[PDB]
């Protein structure tokens, strides 16, 4: 199992998962089956402004923007505990538009998302 | 409504209700939500190297039915399944009457959603 996000995405993320800094943009790296489940569950739980699910290195990345702010560890506590089997990396996204954009391009691709083409820069 | 407390009434006579027994079996069923069942279909298939697995509609939830190549205690299968995900209900019992249980799971009010062999199980596959 991966221990972190793919290397080409790291610079877009916050790496202190127990930070007290609240954010609205998060990513989750997990298996494709866990991601497919969580796509729906996270969308409902947090009434997300946007969520997308992507292919990444034989697994999946979820990218989402919530309307209200949360700590990374609160999002993780919800997501990680739904299904604890296998891996799940949950980090805040600092560079929101660049992260999503990279996730739509080789070596990544969009599987499904809640708004075709994603959000614009000013939405973040 | 409350989550199911047991398998549907149609199926109870085919199951072992002695879930703590030391007896080992090679046919099991799980009653859980459709979302959990879809994930467990793959995870049980892999974990127990199943010889057969099927997922069925049951009263707006799902039942998994599976055969294993080697025997296991029901408590071992339950422990594995319960610990995968925590949300919503999950009931795991051994199956005494293998073909009768599967057959019933393919007919009103039950139906096959997916299964691991096309065309499923037949009566003379067992004796």
From Swiss-Prot, chain A:
Record's subcellular location: Host nucleus
Subunit structure: Isoform large T antigen forms homohexamers in the presence of ATP. Interacts with host HDAC1. Interacts (via LXCXE domain) with host RB1; the interaction induces the aberrant dissociation of RB1-E2F1 complex thereby disrupting RB1's activity. Interacts (via LXCXE domain) with host pRB-related proteins RBL1 and RBL2. Interacts (via C-terminus) with host TOP1 and POLA1 allowing DNA replication. Interacts with host TP53, inhibiting TP53 binding to DNA. Interacts with host preinitiation complex components TBP, TFIIA and TFIID to regulate transcription initiation.
Superkingdom per UniProt: Viruses
Function: Isoform large T antigen is a key early protein essential for both driving viral replication and inducing cellular transformation. Plays a role in viral genome replication by driving entry of quiescent cells into the cell cycle and by autoregulating the synthesis of viral early mRNA. Displays highly oncogenic activities by corrupting the host cellular checkpoint mechanisms that guard cell division and the transcription, replication, and repair of DNA. Participates in the modulation of cellular gene expression preceeding viral DNA replication. Isoform 17kT antigen targets host RBL2 for degradation and promotes cell proliferation. Transactivates host cyclin A promoter through its J domain.
Further comment: The sequence shown is that of strain 776.
Protein name, as recorded: Large T antigen
Disulfide bond entries: none
DNA-binding region(s), residue ranges: 6-121
Free-text description of this protein's post-translational modifications in UniProt: Phosphorylated on both serine and threonine residues. Small t antigen inhibits the dephosphorylation by the AC form of PP2A.
Comment on protein domains: The J domain is essential for multiple viral activities, including virion assembly, viral DNA replication, transformation and transcriptional activation.
